[PDB]
Amino acid sequence: KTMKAAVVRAFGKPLTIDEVPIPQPGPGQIQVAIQASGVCHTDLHAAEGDWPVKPNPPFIPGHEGVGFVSAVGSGVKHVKEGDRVGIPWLYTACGHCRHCLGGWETLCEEQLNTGYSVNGGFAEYVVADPNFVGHLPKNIDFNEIAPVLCAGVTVYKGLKVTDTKPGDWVVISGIGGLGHMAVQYARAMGLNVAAVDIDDRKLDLARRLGATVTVNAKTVADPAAYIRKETDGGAQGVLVTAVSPKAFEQALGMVARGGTVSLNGLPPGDFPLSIFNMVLNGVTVRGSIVGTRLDLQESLDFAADGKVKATIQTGKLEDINAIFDDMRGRIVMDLT
Amino acid sequence: KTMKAAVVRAFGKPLTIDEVPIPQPGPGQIQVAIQASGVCHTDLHAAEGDWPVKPNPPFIPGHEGVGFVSAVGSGVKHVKEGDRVGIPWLYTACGHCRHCLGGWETLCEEQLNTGYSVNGGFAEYVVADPNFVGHLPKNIDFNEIAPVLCAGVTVYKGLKVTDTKPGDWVVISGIGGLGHMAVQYARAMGLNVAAVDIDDRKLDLARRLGATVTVNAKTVADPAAYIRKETDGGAQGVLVTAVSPKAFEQALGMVARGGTVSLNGLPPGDFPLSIFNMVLNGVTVRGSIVGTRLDLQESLDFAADGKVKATIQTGKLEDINAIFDDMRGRIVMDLTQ
């Protein structure tokens, strides 16, 4: 009784694909047989040991694992065998702090994070807290639902915290794995959608997915001015999904007075902010990643109802190191 | 036929106290006999020509002018001679844009600004738009009410946009002209208040005005860490009233996850922002200066009801250059000299 897993033995060094023991579920735990497993840029930073707070090698990355509940520990009510579930970034949270009690468990200072501070989905099996798994709709293929668990909920919640309403303009900055999803959520939320990127093929994709205003930030000299023109003075919201220094600076020129910039990236270093302009223009800048368990259910319901579909590129657990190179739509590893 | 006025005739040069004609109110305008006139850092930036959009010299600064209506122009309703009014930063706004129609006239792209793009209250008389003046409470002396027109409304609105509630912790960063008023608004809004400054005197003022936690940012090893400990993981709101590089950095370390930093200053240059930390911690950073006509009325009511009282240093119109040097509580010129 062993399983295949991609394991980070040491930071920076390529992951070894080893045969390890099948983790078993204690009380209050469950076991999931992973059918598909999405790859996020966060998994990259996990393997690099790049961030202030680091994993402890050896560990299995991955927080877009989806499959079937294969075993159920004692005490576990509700989640039964065969249940279709996903194991997202938020592995568990304390349940008693003011963040947890107020519907903001994503902020819990004692959370554990799947594929980071505990073993994740880059593997055939994973043990998880059933109180925090995502319940997946039956009508959506595993390869296709996997990205909702991080990219999808991230951009959905990101849009909610723009504080916009139907009829408003929202700018999606970056039409990659996160952004192509965000265009679809934004349309389903009744927003008029503008898209910004450096690649005309991605803007073409945004248009097909419902963006009605597009601008190429490399070939147009002043993309912020272009967006202000097309939105009568700027967008009420901007979601920045790929936070390069240029994208951030331009995002701040695209937002209308009183508007909100919502940031989803986890880039390194400091970025320059004109406090003068933020204050004069009454602008809000706000960070958001992932979402609460309720945000994730809501985000899954949009996929279930056909409003949101991820463009995916499929792969195998063995492609993990090449995948990470290609990174340096969404990649999902099919474990079938 | 003429009045005394402090005029900026050239950027960066001394203001002259000049005898200039008394502006007369046309249709839809009123005239105000100024009794007191507050001085703001914005006036200094107006006189220096520091900012990207500049005044057009010669002009009279001042957007904290308070006094009595002295003449009423054709067609003006309700306002009469003797009414107590102030002429704040927002001189007028278009009344038809989405910002104006939504009750956010402070954002109007066509606004004029008192003592910046039109003449202001550093003079014995001002012509104003009666739809935009502040209506002052009769029980508060002019010298004392003047600072509510810019400092008070700024920190009051700044606090409203921290998105906090009674019982939450808020930090007031900087206990100067703005900050000492912010302490009082914050306590009146049911907040628990922490104060941060670099001067123990200002911190003791904060305490007497209601702050139950104080920290000296220069004499403590890690002021942010100390604030987080005293507020059980950080403040739900942080109001930054004096925006130095260090105060901004420390402010971001003081906010709880999911919290909001409200910025009230107009410092030059760019400040470093860790997006990684903003995103991981779910933090909001928001700019807010002055406020709408309704924000100002609400701010004035707190003064009317004794909940907020400005500490003022009085001066004379003639002192205005000396006053600008001192700046390089609140300064208020008393025109009943």
Added chain:
Amino acid sequence: KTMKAAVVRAFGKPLTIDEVPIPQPGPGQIQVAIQASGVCHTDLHAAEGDWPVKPNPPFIPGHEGVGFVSAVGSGVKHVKEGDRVGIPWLYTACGHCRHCLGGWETLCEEQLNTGYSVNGGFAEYVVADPNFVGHLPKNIDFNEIAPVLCAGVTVYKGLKVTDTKPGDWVVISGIGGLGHMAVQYARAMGLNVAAVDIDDRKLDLARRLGATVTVNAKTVADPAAYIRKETDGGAQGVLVTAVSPKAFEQALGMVARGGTVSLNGLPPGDFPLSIFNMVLNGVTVRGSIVGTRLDLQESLDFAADGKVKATIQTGKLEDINAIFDDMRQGNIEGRIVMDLT
């Protein structure tokens, strides 16, 4: 010298079509040559004297009058002859009270109301306050746009104050002039829509406009119980646009715990409220009145962009009494708009 106008002379009696003087704009006013004029059930309530505060006959009803600016009074800025405008219920407001300053001018105690406390658009010309007219999208026909000036703006704002979010369920109660517009706004706002009425043709209209759940409250004893079943325990929002108090009473049973029932309809009298159920279930009931000038602009942009479209049949000013019979008897599909061209 004169124009044609439909005038209420006495409550409950037929309106007469009379030649009256053309109103002339004074300072700060405009005149509008009316091209189309929506018939709102408020005009009927005003013609019947249904409400505790009544108009003062003789008056011209109509607050869904749309057309071209035909003259401009002294001092008026921006508006010019030929501009496409509508004169809605909120004719004017004071501009200085706390409601007006804080984005809630629809609550202003000094407002005047078009076709009620001032003469309205059941006439060839209206004199208006240009500060409060709707500015109409040029790509939409007058007959089609007219209902947005009240039916549209009202249900748009009514939906905003349900405090719902995309993906939530909303129930529209009463699929008439307001209600058929409400189904469409709700769908454009990202809501799933249930519809309730007392006539299967109105439920069919709802379904064609995007409702995916329907129930007939005249044939089904407990419509609320069917709604709850079809929405997993109730809708997060309910908009009552109906003209019967019993609708209001039954709406309270359609909302999920923590949900909000938004009230637009204005039948006379009271409905019984179970305070017990409201408190146990954490329910909100909220009255919603037309919309602010900003709400109106937003609501017009939906019609401009093709996201909503009023279902209309045109009539003539002379037919107003037959139109009121039709309205009273529930034989209007959507809205009747009088065409004055």
Added chain:
Amino acid sequence: KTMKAAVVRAFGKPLTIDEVPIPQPGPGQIQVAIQASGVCHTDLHAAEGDWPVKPNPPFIPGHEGVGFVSAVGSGVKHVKEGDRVGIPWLYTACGHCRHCLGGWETLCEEQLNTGYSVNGGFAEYVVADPNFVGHLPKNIDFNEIAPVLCAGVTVYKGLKVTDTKPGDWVVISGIGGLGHMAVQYARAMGLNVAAVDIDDRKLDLARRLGATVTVNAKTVADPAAYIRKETDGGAQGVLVTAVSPKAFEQALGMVARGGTVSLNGLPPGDFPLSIFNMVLNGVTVRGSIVGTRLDLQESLDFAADGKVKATIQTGKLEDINAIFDDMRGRIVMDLTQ
């Protein structure tokens, strides 16, 4: 082996003080040694079997029990023996529905209610779910903190859902067990407070607690008009703590346009609501009872900081039937004396 408990053996019959087994904590549970136990009108309605969904007799009422954790079942992290805790109305909730996941566990369709659907605190021990107990501030006596668990949290959350802000006027209708606490929470929330009741003595108490505007609804012919005059046009919020036909009708007359009436009682029957008035005035009427776990913690912190203090009258478990007669400020049975 056994314990004292007041047991409802049959609806509408006197409670029998019986000798019953001590409940034992299974896994995921704790046992609490009750020191004080507040009585609420809800306990009377439970005993009487008045409501559509009823208890299943025999049962022990009481959802304001406070005391010391006396044993801890297996699996229970965090909560320990000797911990100071209360067992409020919300005994448990499912933790997986949209209400529970959204921070609105008070609305959970699968909740159990202490002293109603499970045995409660009218006894020396109670078995509780540690995830849902209230953690009491160490500085407040048991008799004094008990009412916060229902009365206090009820009016606090009630006030939060008036959607008001500091400086607004709120009216507290009914100054009894709930309302005298409500006056104190409202003042601590920065509200200007008006009070309505039929008894000059309760209005005098409301004044001592911070209400500046008072009216006797029995001796003043038109109390709503009085309140409208005194609040310059109506209150932005009204909290109705005792919901009679007359108090409801008057509350709706006291609210400004766009204001909010928050209802805290569970009265029988139907109440007339004018549709025309609700719509033209843009009024909100909303129901609220008790609160979430977070709401309760917040309400407890106000008690801990001395901003809210319940007036209590003490009694004994054996008095319960006499207490209910008296019923048909807050009564708290002291189980130590």
